[PDB]
Ligand binder design. Structure first.
Ligand SMILES: CCCCCCCCCCCCCCCCCC(=O)OC[C@H](COP(=O)([O-])OCC(O)COP(=O)([O-])OC[C@@H](COC(=O)CCCCCCCCCCCCCCCCC)OC(=O)CCCCCCCCCCCCCCCCC)OC(=O)CCCCCCCCCCCCCCCCC
Ligand SMILES: CCCCCCCCCCCCCCCCCC(=O)OC[C@H](COP(=O)([O-])OCC(O)COP(=O)([O-])OC[C@@H](COC(=O)CCCCCCCCCCCCCCCCC)OC(=O)CCCCCCCCCCCCCCCCC)OC(=O)CCCCCCCCCCCCCCCCC
Ligand code: BCL
Ligand code: BCL
Ligand SMILES: CC[C@H]1c2cc3[nH]c4c(c3C)C(=O)[C@H](C(=O)OC)c4c3nc(cc4[nH]c(cc(n2)[C@@H]1C)c(C(C)=O)c4C)[C@@H](C)[C@@H]3CCC(=O)OC/C=C(\C)CCC[C@H](C)CCC[C@H](C)CCCC(C)C
Ligand SMILES: COC1=C(OC)C(=O)C(C/C=C(\C)CC/C=C(\C)CC/C=C(\C)CC/C=C(\C)CC/C=C(\C)CC/C=C(\C)CC/C=C(\C)CC/C=C(\C)CC/C=C(\C)CCC=C(C)C)=C(C)C1=O
Ligand SMILES: CCCCCCCCCCCCCCCCCC(=O)OC[C@H](COP(=O)([O-])OCC[N+](C)(C)C)OC(=O)CCCCCCCCCCCCCCCCC
Ligand SMILES: COC(C)(C)C/C=C/C(C)=C/C=C/C(C)=C/C=C/C(C)=C/C=C/C=C(C)/C=C\C=C(\C)CC/C=C(\C)CCC=C(C)C
Ligand SMILES: COC(C)(C)C/C=C/C(C)=C/C=C/C(C)=C/C=C/C(C)=C/C=C\C=C(C)\C=C\C=C(/C)CC/C=C(\C)CCC=C(C)C
Ligand SMILES: COC(C)(C)C\C=C/C(C)=C/C=C/C(C)=C/C=C/C(C)=C/C=C/C=C(C)/C=C/C=C(\C)CC/C=C(\C)CCC=C(C)C
Lengths: 52, 254, 43, 304, 281, 52, 43, 52, 43, 43, 52, 51, 43, 52, 41
């Protein structure tokens, strides 16, 4: 509950932009691992579900 | 255009390589003529003008229009060479033949000969675009602070004979370049004298100057102004200091 | 004191509205993960 | 015994923002930085850049180029990040198939190559114009642009011209780290032994001469830095013992010398002639000469 | 023979060996002990090249080639007609180069300037030696060195490089390349910058270091400084030749196969090998 | 929620620029992922659908 | 406090206009994903 | 709406040239995309139409 | 008020002009996309 | 209003001549494209 | 209609350089492209027409 | 008395170091698990659920 | 002080909060570990 | 016995970070060597303890 | 050499040693734990 203090230690601008890049890269990497695996490729699974 | 010889075995490739030889010849001409703007006409040891003035002719004068209203400089020219011409040279011919040295008659560090030679640059200082002096002592250079490294100020100045002569006082800086050119000394003899940073090695406990010994630190040329330094004084100082790698070697220890 | 120079109050207000944000992110994440578990169970 | 390689003492001050000589100050930035890791070997100020129109053109186009190649890298990698970071060097945006000739490739790899190349075209020419303009705004000479134009000449000869003369975009270079090396090798092997391309030999001569010359010049100017030889513009106009000593070193050494301006003239040519001779020697490969070892035999620098 | 300022520097001294004996000039040239040595060695090597091609009967300067002994000769001295000439010429060339360096030293200390130049030259001598002295010794035979022919040392390069496939995959070679390219680049940029300051648009005044720094800060956001660029190009050349010597001394002594197979240690790391995707799957 | 203070954290011009490049690059990434998959290719599909 | 120095009310109007454009873009993208789902689904 | 405030944060020059570059390059990219396709290639189409 | 220093009048009119141009552009784009779909539907 | 040191009189004259030239260039281009349509149609 | 204010932004002596450059590039691109097509290569089609 | 570390080290440096280190560690462990057919969760799941 | 000059007590506070965070982290981790051993054990 | 001044000798800050780096690296390498040996690989032992 | 450890050299070293102890006890427990399960010598 004392966690609010950190911003007295960091400049929230730097924290925020680094946070953003972190999140975006993580997303693209997780999504990509999934696309790569034949199962979990929502596109191939869909095309199989609707038989296209 | 394969297998197409205009005559004999000559095709575009041969034409191009030969054209290149020609262009290259003209280019060597151009460059070795533009390397003639300083130093020519060729002299003898007598100061005369010699018969062999090179196989490449001296080129036609150009003009340098200087910043800060310092005038027009024409190279090649007689004014250019005669300004930077040294006179009253303490030298003695070693032989009547040419191609032999000329000995220094007296003290060379002072007489300004040999590695200790200087050139009469103009007793006006070096300027930035704004026209302010280039070399200011760090105290007049507003905003200038040591951003790193060993701050030498206050360190003793060991010399070539391993003896100590004084303490550093101030740093002379290239403000537009943000670097240290000269360092000043508060000498034991009560005098201030400059020494180029490139000739001084900052140790942790001291500043070492292996160029010259202690007898020399006193006879170093001075500055008519303590806030500025001209190109002339710079050449005199730098030559004097650098000459110690030859003319004070019997004194250098370790 | 504060390396940032931030006020003590400033710190609490920044962390609070920041936490609202982290929390929004987490809640959308949970909704999404749960949704996917039904369509495909990864475990 | 101080050789002036690493700076001993650093100093700094308020950043040197610039010199207003016709530059548009609003297209300039106002933030600088100090990073002493460089101060040891150079100036530490990562100083203000100029953000202009041509610069924006270049940045946008070249970033599209980069990210296009990365996109094809991904597709070629199965979208598996580990494959990407595994085959990163072995991957390639290979060049169009010869079937298409100089037409717009009817494949994905091919048209991606074509587009990435359009982007590179835009970027490079924008940057050349940016050099010209930055030297025209500060009132300086355009030597930097005419030097870059030499590099552009080679780069064009390899991507645009030589193929148009040969009728195939297949001839152009792939965008990879190992595939453009393979391209160079296969280019030599297809056309004789490139060594026997006299213009190749000349470009080599001038590359080695550029290294020769810069080591010479740099070692000299550090040797005469104790007399302020580093300040050159002022030794062209107000000559001092630095220039005299350097000139006389080279005279007493090899019989000839230069001046603090003419050595700069020598440098500008050894540099550009590396890519002027290369461009020609590459143009002539396959358009005028299908094999260079035989041309040599016929022309007398190679034996029968 | 003198320049308008060559006199006050023509003083005695600055001699590592010798003394008054040999402290004189011949035309523009300074000739000390080491000047005499380099002249002797150079002249001898030249005349031996000519006699070698004379014995061969070749007189075309491009087809003249003096080749090293066979590889079977091993590291012994051979007949002059089968390698002895190459060997003597190598001896003389090395003496000549080292003497050129030491002459440069004598001159640098007569003119009171630093010894950066002979240092730079030392790397080149080191590489030449790596090629004709060291690498052989470690490889067992003089015949692995290069010949003294304008268009034949190129054939040696080609064959030696194709022994290990595309030499391009040698990493030290990569670094040599990169530093060479960057060297030419920086050379052109320096020259162009300086000439553009000194020789600006018509009707404008000469420029200064501030304008150079500003132009390159404008262009790429950083300027290295008037001293830093010299430092830089020097170090670039040296590290290039350093990497180039490193690339060759390890080619046939520590490595023996195609150089491509080296980078396959990154592929073959267990956590991305089996992956079926990309080039290596 | 009082998120607006993020504009008191860092500047609008730079965040806007980054946002623009990010969105365009993402749009392109996705459209390309689609074009790569045989189905989801708006062009080849329309060609199947309309003959040709 | 305000590193950028934007006032509270200037910031409020900035966020208003920003989120206006944002919601516009988002609902357009929604329209788009709907039309796609209709011609070809993917889940 | 108050979109007209964007010109209080963006300068017309940078934005105008960026938009010009972006649009022209996008046009060229999409035209080449099409011409790579035996379908939609108006040249080849009008070729087959007029029987040439 | 403005990081650029401009006024609301200048910005208002600038925006009006830029948007008129944008509308002309988008207009021609729609015209052409429609003529195309009629020429060779891509959906 | 003006970042380029021009006034309305100057700029209106300038747009006048510029658009004159532009209409002329477009005119010759249209003529050419029509002649080519007659020669070889691309649609 | 108030387009004439563009020249209150851009100094025209650079805009004219850029415009002419762009136009020449484009003319060359399209001319070449057509030359890459036996159907639109005017030289070759004329050769065939007249029958030379 | 482990509180005395904060005087030796700077929390700003420790947070920007520990964070990156822990992230790296987690990524590495996860990858090592994935490299093994067993412990590759995505793979296991597909088989258990019959997909 | 000798190094950072962090005020004591505040340094102790920093130690407390840091430790709370560490405990939070380790707990989440162990919970995850136990979750897994039961799903797929290793020992 | 008299080990109190190892700190007067060494600046505490650098030493601690170096120690940390060294320990982490050494652990990583020993674990790697163990996982390298099929016999000593813990994950593989689990594959034996449970049939999976 | 630091010049700040004249007094607290004792403190620094002692706490460092305490940390060392915690680490080593954990390590020894770990080594015992592994040896029974798989014995390496
Ligand atoms: C300021 C200076 C600037 C310089 C650069 C300026 C550049 C601008 C351009 C200047 C103009 C340059 C000329 C360009 C046009 C011609 C170039 C050319 O060589 O064309 C091929 C043309 C020959 O065509 P081909 O089909 O090969 O020969 C057919 C012949 O009927 C018969 O030939 P073949 O089929 O019998 O075969 C060749 C044969 C015969 O070869 C020859 O006919 C002549 C060979 C010896 C030539 C020696 C040249 C010596 C010149 C240098 C010496 C002085 C130094 C000056 C330079 C100092 C600086 C280094 O080879 C042999 O050696 C036979 C030996 C006996 C066997 C039994 O040139 C020649 O006639 C031969 C070379 C002529 C001398 C070149 C002088 C340089
Ligand atoms: C059978 C044949 C036999 C043999 C025939 C042999 C005949 C020989 C005749 C004599 C030729 C000697 C040429 C060398 C003299 C240059 C000396 C020098 O360093 O400075 C002079 C001096 C420099 O002035 P400065 O001291 O810097 O200060 C002047 C201002 O105050 C301040 O300066 P600024 O900023 O206003 O201007 C600076 C510029 C002063 O100059 C200029 O401002 C104009 C420079 C020329 C720029 C280009 C002209 C515009 C049109 C270009 C078209 C390009 C098409 C691509 C698209 C467009 C790109 C823009 O400074 C220079 O250094 C100019 C020299 C530049 C030479 C070219 C370098 C880039 C070429 C790269 C290759 C690209 C083309 C492909 C080549 C291969 C083709 C197969 O300028 C002059 O004396 C006049 C300029 C000369 C005009 C160009 C003519 C020579 C070009 C030769 C290029 C090599 C050709 C390949 C050889 C053949 C191979 C097969
Ligand atoms: C570098 C590693 C390879 C090598 C690979 C290549 C390649 C690749 C090429 C040559 C080329 C050249 N090399 Mg080399 N070269 C090597 C070793 C040498 C040595 C030596 C003493 O070791 C010498 C003197 C030469 C000589 C030469 C010239 C004939 C030519 C241009 C060099 C140049 O411009 O230098 C730069 C410096 C200068 C510009 C100064 C000028 C020096 C002059 C021109 C040297 C001539 C020497 C003379 C004929 C013989 C002495 C009597 N090389 C080694 C074995 N060299 C190029 C060529 O055109 O060959 C046909 C070429 O294609
Ligand atoms: C085994 C294969 C063949 C061979 C095949 C080729 C081929 C093929 C070529 C040469 C070429 C060259 N080779 Mg090789 N080469 C061989 C043997 C040698 C040997 C040797 C010792 O054996 C040497 C020293 C050389 C020497 C050389 C150079 C002299 C020359 C290229 C110089 C240059 O600057 O290129 C690099 C220069 C450029 C490409 C300039 C490009 C500049 C542009 C503007 C870059 C755009 C930047 C971009 C946007 C990136 C942005 C970066 C970020 C902003 C940071 N080669 C062997 C025998 N070589 C070239 C040449 O001239 O051919 C005659 C060439 O194309
Ligand atoms: C004269 C021949 C030499 C040369 C010169 C040369 N190159 C030049 C210049 C000059 C004089 C510049 O002024 C310009 C420059 O800014 O240099 C610092 C440049 C330049 N040559 C460059 C690189 C380069 N030069 C090379 C070499 C050479 N160019 C020759 C050896 C080489 C190689 C491998 O041969 C390369 C890779 C760039 C650093 C720069 C061209 C800038 C450019 O066009 O950038 C376009 C792309 C972007 C702006 C976006 C990139 C996107 C990614 C994030 C990356
Ligand atoms: C700061 O400014 C600067 C200058 O200007 C002050 C300069 O000049 C230079 C120097 C640079 C140049 C001149 C540029 C041109 C250089 C090159 C192209 C490099 C390549 C050079 C050559 C091809 C020429 C090589 C010539 C040689 C090796 C000389 C050959 C001569 C002999 C073998 C004869 C030697 C004779 C002796 C020893 C005496 C004989 C004895 C007897 C008893 C008789 C630089 C770097 C510089 O930075
Ligand atoms: C073969 C390439 C040239 C080899 C050197 C020949 C000249 C020499 O050694 O000394 C000349 C002599 C040696 O010194 P010197 O004292 O005899 O020369 C005196 C020169 N003057 C009369 C003008 C003062 O120097 C000259 O002649 C001066 C100009 C020479 C310029 C040579 C530059 C060649 C660069 C080649 C680049 C391209 C390579 C591909
Ligand atoms: C890899 O395996 C092979 C096969 C090679 C076998 C092994 C080979 C070798 C050579 C192994 C070598 C191992 C070594 C050298 C191990 C050494 C281990 C040691 C010495 C560990 C010591 C750890 C000590 C610790 C962690 C001490 C303290 C911990 C802290 C967190 C510091 C806290 C301190 C504070 C707060 C300082 C107080 C500050 C003030 C100002 C009072
Ligand atoms: C991390 O992953 C992401 C996706 C986020 C980003 C990654 C990006 C990556 C991995 C990028 C990698 C890029 C690489 C490896 C680039 C390498 C390029 C190399 C080595 C190029 C070498 C030579 C290229 C040459 C010589 C190309 C010349 C091309 C031209 C001259 C173009 C001329 C015009 C052409 C071909 C036709 C078009 C003309 C007109 C007028 C339209
Ligand atoms: C499996 O085999 C291999 C070899 C792959 C790996 C095996 C074993 C290895 C190498 C294991 C290594 C384990 C290690 C080194 C674990 C270390 C864990 C630690 C030290 C974790 C610490 C976590 C700390 C956290 C999460 C702290 C958070 C703190 C905060 C959020 C507080 C921030 C706010 C503050 C301080 C308020 C600001 C204060 C003031 C006064 C203004």
């Amino acid at each position: 509950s004392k966690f609010y203090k950190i911003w007295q230690v960091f400049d929230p601008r730097r924290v925020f932009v680094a946070q953003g890049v972190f999140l975006f890269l993580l997303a693209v990497m997780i999504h990509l691992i999934l696309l790569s695996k034949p199962d979990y490729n929502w596109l191939d699974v869909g095309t199989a579900k609707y038989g296209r | 255009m394969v297998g197409v010889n205009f005559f004999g075995d000559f095709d575009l490739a041969s034409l191009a390589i030969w054209s290149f030889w020609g262009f290259l010849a003209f280019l060597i001409y151009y460059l070795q003529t533009e390397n003639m703007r300083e130093g020519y006409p060729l002299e003898m040891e007598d100061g005369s003008v010699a018969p062999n003035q090179g196989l490449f002719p001296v080129p036609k004068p150009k003009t340098f229009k200087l910043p800060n209203g310092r005038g027009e400089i024409v190279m090649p020219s007689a004014e250019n060479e005669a300004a930077h011409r040294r006179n009253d040279l303490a030298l003695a011919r070693t032989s009547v033949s040419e191609g032999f040295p000329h000995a220094p008659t007296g003290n060379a560090l002072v007489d300004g000969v040999g590695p200790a030679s200087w050139v009469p640059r103009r007793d006006e200082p070096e300027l930035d675009a704004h026209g302010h002096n280039k070399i200011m002592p760090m105290a007049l250079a507003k905003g200038f602070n040591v951003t790193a490294g060993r701050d030498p100020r206050g360190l003793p100045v060991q010399a070539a004979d391993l003896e100590v002569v004084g303490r550093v006082s101030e740093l002379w800086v290239d403000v537009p370049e943000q670097m240290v050119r000269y360092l000043e000394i508060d000498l034991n003899s009560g005098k201030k004298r400059l020494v180029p940073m490139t000739l001084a090695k900052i140790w942790a406990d001291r500043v070492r100057v292996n160029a010259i010994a202690s007898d020399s630190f006193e006879n170093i040329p001075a500055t008519r102004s303590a806030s500025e330094v001209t190109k002339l004084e710079e050449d005199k100082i730098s030559g004097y200091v650098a000459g110690g790698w030859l003319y004070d070697a019997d004194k250098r220890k370790r | 004191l504060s390396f940032t120079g931030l006020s003590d109050e400033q710190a609490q207000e920044l962390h609070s509205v920041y936490m609202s944000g982290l929390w929004l992110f987490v809640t959308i994440a949970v909704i999404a993960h749960i949704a996917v578990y039904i369509w495909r169970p990864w475990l | 015994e101080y050789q002036n390689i690493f700076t001993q003492v650093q100093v700094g001050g308020a950043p040197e923002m610039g010199l207003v000589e016709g530059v548009d100050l609003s297209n300039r930035t106002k933030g600088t930085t100090n990073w002493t890791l460089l101060g040891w070997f150079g100036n530490a100020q990562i100083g203000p850049i100029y953000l202009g129109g041509w610069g924006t053109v270049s940045l946008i186009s070249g970033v599209l180029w980069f990210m296009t190649i990365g996109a094809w890298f991904w597709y070629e990698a199965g979208f598996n990040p580990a494959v990407f970071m595994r085959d990163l060097f072995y991957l390639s945006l290979d060049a169009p198939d010869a079937k298409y000739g100089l037409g717009v490739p009817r494949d994905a790899e091919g048209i991606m190559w074509f587009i990435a190349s359009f982007f590179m075209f835009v970027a490079v020419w924008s940057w050349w114009i940016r050099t010209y303009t930055r030297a025209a705004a500060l009132g300086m000479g355009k030597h930097t642009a005419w030097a870059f134009l030499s590099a552009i000449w080679l780069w064009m000869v390899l991507g645009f011209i030589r193929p148009i003369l040969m009728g195939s975009w297949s001839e152009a270079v792939p965008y990879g780290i190992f595939t453009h090396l393979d391209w160079t090798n296969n280019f030599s092997l297809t056309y004789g032994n490139l060594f026997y391309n006299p213009f190749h030999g000349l470009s080599i001569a001038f590359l080695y001469g550029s290294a020769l010359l810069f080591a010479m010049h740099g070692a000299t100017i550090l040797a005469v830095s104790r007399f302020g030889g580093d300040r050159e513009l002022e030794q062209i106009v107000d000559r001092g013992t630095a220039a005299e000593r350097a000139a006389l070193f080279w005279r007493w050494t090899m019989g000839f010398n230069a001046t603090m301006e003419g050595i700069h003239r020598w440098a500008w040519w050894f540099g550009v002639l590396v890519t002027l001779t290369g461009g020609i020697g590459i143009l002539l490969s396959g358009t005028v000469v299908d094999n260079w070892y035989v041309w040599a035999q016929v022309h007398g620098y190679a034996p029968v | 023979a003198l320049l308008s300022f060559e006199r006050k520097y023509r003083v005695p001294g600055g001699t590592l060996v010798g003394g008054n004996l040999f402290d004189f000039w011949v035309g523009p040239f300074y000739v000390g002990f080491f000047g005499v040595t380099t002249f002797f060695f150079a002249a001898l090597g030249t005349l031996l090249i000519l006699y070698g091609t004379a014995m061969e009967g070749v007189w075309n300067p491009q087809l003249i080639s003096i080749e090293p002994p066979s590889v079977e000769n091993g590291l012994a001295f051979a007949p002059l007609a089968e390698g002895g000439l190459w060997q003597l010429i190598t001896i003389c060339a090395l003496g000549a180069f080292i003497s050129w360096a030491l002459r440069e030293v004598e001159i640098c200390r007569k003119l009171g300037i630093g010894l950066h130049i002979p240092f730079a030259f030392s790397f080149a001598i080191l590489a030449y030696a790596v090629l004709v002295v060291f690498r052989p010794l470690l490889m067992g035979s003089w015949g692995y060195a290069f010949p003294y022919g304008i268009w034949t040392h190129l054939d040696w390069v080609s064959n030696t490089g194709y022994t290990y496939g595309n030499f391009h995959y040698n990493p030290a070679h990569m670094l040599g390349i990169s530093f060479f390219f960057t060297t030419a680049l920086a050379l052109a940029l320096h020259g162009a910058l300086v000439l553009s300051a000194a020789n600006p648009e018509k009707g404008q005044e000469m420029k200064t270091a501030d304008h150079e720094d500003t132009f390159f800060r404008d262009l790429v956001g950083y300027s290295i400084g008037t001293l830093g660029i010299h430092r830089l190009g020097l170090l670039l050349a040296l590290m290039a030749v350093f990497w180039s010597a490193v690339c060759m001394i390890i080619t046939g002594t520590i490595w023996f196969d195609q150089w491509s197979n080296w980078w396959y240690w990154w592929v073959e790391l267990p956590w991305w090998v089996d992956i079926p995707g990309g080039v290596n799957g």
